[PDB]
Amino acid sequence: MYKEPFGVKVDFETGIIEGAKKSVRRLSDMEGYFVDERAWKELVEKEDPVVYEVYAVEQEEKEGDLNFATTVLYPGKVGKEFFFTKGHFHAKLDRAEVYVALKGKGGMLLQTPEGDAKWISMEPGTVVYVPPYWAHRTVNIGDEPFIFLAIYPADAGHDYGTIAEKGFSKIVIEENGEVKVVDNPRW
Amino acid sequence: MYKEPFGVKVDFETGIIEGAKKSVRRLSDMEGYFVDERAWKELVEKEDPVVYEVYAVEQEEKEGDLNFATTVLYPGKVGKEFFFTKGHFHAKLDRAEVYVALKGKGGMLLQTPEGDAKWISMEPGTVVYVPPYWAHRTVNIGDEPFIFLAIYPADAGHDYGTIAEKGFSKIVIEENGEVKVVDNPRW
Numbered sequence: 551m552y553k554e555p556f557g558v559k560v561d562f563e564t565g566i567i568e569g570a571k572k573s574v575r576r577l578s579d580m581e582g583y584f585v586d587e588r589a590w591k592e593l594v595e596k597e598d599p600v601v602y603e604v605y606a607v608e609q610e611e612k613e614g615d616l617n618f619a620t621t622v623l624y625p626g627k628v629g630k631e632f633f634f635t636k637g638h639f640h641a642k643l644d645r646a647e648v649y650v651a652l653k654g655k656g657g658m659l660l661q662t663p664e665g666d667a668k669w670i671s672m673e674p675g676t677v678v679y680v681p682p683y684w685a686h687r688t689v690n691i692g693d694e695p696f697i698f699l700a701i702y703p704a705d706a707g708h709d710y711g712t713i714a715e716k717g718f719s720k721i722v723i724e725e726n727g728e729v730k731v732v733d734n735p736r737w
Numbered sequence: 738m739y740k741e742p743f744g745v746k747v748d749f750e751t752g753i754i755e756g757a758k759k760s761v762r763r764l765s766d767m768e769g770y771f772v773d774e775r776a777w778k779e780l781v782e783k784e785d786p787v788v789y790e791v792y793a794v795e796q797e798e799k800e801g802d803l804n805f806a807t808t809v810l811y812p813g814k815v816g817k818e819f820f821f822t823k824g825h826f827h828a829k830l831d832r833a834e835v836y837v838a839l840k841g842k843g844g845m846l847l848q849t850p851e852g853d854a855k856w857i858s859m860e861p862g863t864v865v866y867v868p869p870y871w872a873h874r875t876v877n878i879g880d881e882p883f884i885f886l887a888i889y890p891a892d893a894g895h896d897y898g899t900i901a902e903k904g905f906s907k908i909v910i911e912e913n914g915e916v917k918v919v920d921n922p923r924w
């Protein structure tokens with residue numbers, strides 16, 4: 551039986567999607583992710599702020615089909631490091647992804663199975679192409695929420711494990727009032 | 738070898754993607770698409786207007802990779818029928834598509850291989866899920882350009898022929914100042 555086509559309203563101001571399933575990631579949910587463990591533990595104990603929320607509209611895992619989701623990435627820093635999404639590779643490594651930036655100032659960090667990294671800046675209107683085999687993470691480098699829509703293959707799945715253990719070969723920090731992408735000492 | 742990640746600017750007011758492949762379809766490229774053949778002949782002679790332009794960023798046709806494109810669908814009528822895109826099924830029938838409406842007033846007409854139809858209104862912010870197996874055509878029901886962004890599997894391909902010969906089982910016309918979706922009499 552064919553699936554029913556539908557339309558859902560996406561609010562470009564809030565990132566809210568009608569009919570989507572919500573996910574909330576708090577700072578506590580990201581242990582071992584930031585370089586400055588002291589600032590992390592401090593921020594968690596003090597307020598454990600929400601780092602980001604995802605509104606996902608997903609299908610059964612089937613070749614050729616597509617999922618889409620917005621993310622609202624809140625502004626913040628853990629020590630010198632800007633708030634970011636956990637980041638992942640796809641379970642089916644060769645699945646690509648397309649991001650559309652809607653609001654705020656941010657960017658995407660990407661890296662290969664081997665660690666070679668790239669940084670792509672994102673402002674409203676920017677569409678980012680995430681090629682097959684690249685892990686990807688988004689970072690809010692500004693003062694307001696960074697909101698974007700992502701469209702990805704239904705069967706792409708997720709590999710958070712690799713990233714959670716080694717992180718990205720680079721980190722994005724504020725140094726002298728400036729955003730800088732630098733080597734991860736933890737790597 | 739890994740492909741290079743990249744970002745491109747999409748302009749939400751004009752639908753133009755900087756550096757993208759541009760395609761232009763004029764009414765003369767749409768012989769046998771509109772119900773009112775005489776009105777089609779007449780409008781082509783008087784003016785041969787651009788019905789739509791597409792700005793496409795495509796990858797090689799491999800499983801799991803993704804293409805994206807904007808379309809600028811111009812306002813107009815052929816007789817009583819609103820300007821529309823040619824419409825197609827995918828070559829790999831079971832490939833889905835996701836559409837994001839950016840500007841203007843329109844909608845999508847979809848139908849199964851058996852001719853069952855569905856109409857989904859589109860205003861700015863509407864995201865439409867085009868399921869596996871469903872042919873899809875966009876229609877402009879207002880007086881300004883209807884602009885939207887579409888993301889689709891790189892291997893989906895196109896099947897235009899099926900629609901080129903028999904059309905869609907429904908049409909979208911203006912009747913008594915109102916938009917109406919009704920049976921295609923030539924189907």
Ligand SMILES: O=C(O)[C@@H](O)[C@H](O)[C@H](O)COP(=O)(O)O
Binds near residue numbers: 638688
């Ligand atoms: O599909 C995606 O890759 C995004 O929707 C991310 O899942 C989302 O931004 C949250 O990031 P992560 O999944 O890395 O926690």
Ligand SMILES: O=C(O)[C@@H](O)[C@H](O)[C@H](O)COP(=O)(O)O
Binds near residue numbers: 791822873874887889
């Ligand atoms: O991926 C899509 O289906 C869209 O980009 C359409 O191709 C585009 O709107 C043009 O319509 P058609 O391809 O039916 O002429």
Ligand code: NI
Binds near residue numbers: 638640702
């Ligand atoms: Ni992903």
Ligand code: NI
Binds near residue numbers: 825827834873889
């Ligand atoms: Ni299509």
